[PDB]
Amino acid sequence: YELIGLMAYPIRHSLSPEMQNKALEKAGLPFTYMAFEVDNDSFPGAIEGLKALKMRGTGVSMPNKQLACEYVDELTPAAKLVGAINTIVNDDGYLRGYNTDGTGHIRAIKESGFDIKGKTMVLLGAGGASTAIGAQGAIEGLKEIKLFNRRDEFFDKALAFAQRVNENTDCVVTVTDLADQQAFAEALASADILTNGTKVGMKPLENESLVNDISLLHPGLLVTECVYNPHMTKLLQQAQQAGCKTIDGYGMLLWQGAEQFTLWTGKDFPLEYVKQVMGF
Ligand SMILES: NC(=O)C1=CN([C@@H]2O[C@H](COP(=O)(O)OP(=O)(O)OC[C@H]3O[C@@H](n4cnc5c(N)ncnc54)[C@H](O)[C@@H]3O)[C@@H](O)[C@H]2O)C=CC1
Q: Same domain, yes or no, for 153 and 233?
A: yes
Query: Residue 123 maps to which CATH number?
Result: 3.40.50.720
Q: Same domain, yes or no, for 115 and 231?
A: yes
Q: Same domain, yes or no, for 22 and 84?
A: yes
Q: Same domain, yes or no, for 52 and 112?
A: no
Q: Same domain, yes or no, for 224 and 136?
A: yes
Q: Same domain, yes or no, for 240 and 120?
A: yes
Residue 54 phi, psi dihedral angles, 5° rounding: 60, 55
Query: Residue 5 maps to which CATH number?
Result: 3.40.50.10860
Q: Into how many domains does the chain fold?
A: 2
Task: Enter the resolution in angstroms.
Answer: 2.5
Q: Same domain, yes or no, for 231 and 130?
A: yes
Residue 246 near residue 239 (C-beta atoms within 8 A): yes
Q: Same domain, yes or no, for 108 and 237?
A: yes
CB-CB neighbours of 240 under 10 Å: 12
Q: How far apart are CA 228 and CA 252, in angstroms?
A: 9
Nearest Cα residue to atom 29 of ligand 1: 200
Ligand 1 pocket: which residues have CB below 6 Å? 101, 125-130, 149-150, 152, 154, 178, 197-200, 202, 226-228, 249, 252-253, 256
Handedness of CA 141, 144, 148, 154 (dihedral sign): positive
Q: In sequence order, what E strands does the chain have? A: 2-8, 31-37, 57-60, 87-91, 94-98, 120-124, 144-148, 172-176, 193-196, 222-225, 245-247
Nearest Cα residue to atom 43 of ligand 1: 129
Nearest Cα residue to atom 41 of ligand 1: 227
Q: Same domain, yes or no, for 229 and 124?
A: yes
CA 149, 151, 155: angle at the middle one, nearest 5?
A: 50
Where in the sequence is the domain holding 221, given as residue range(s)? 99-247
Q: How far apart are CA 244 and CA 223, in angstroms?
A: 7
Nearest Cα residue to atom 5 of ligand 1: 226
Q: Same domain, yes or no, for 120 and 237?
A: yes
Residue-wise DSSP of 128-152: HHHHHHHHHHHHTT-SEEEEE--SS
Q: List for the chain the helix, strand, coil content (%; round to 5).
A: 40, 20, 40
Q: Same domain, yes or no, for 46 and 142?
A: no
Q: Same domain, yes or no, for 141 and 191?
A: yes
Bridge pairing between strands 94-98 and 87-91: antiparallel
CA of 274 to the centre of ligand 1 (A): 24
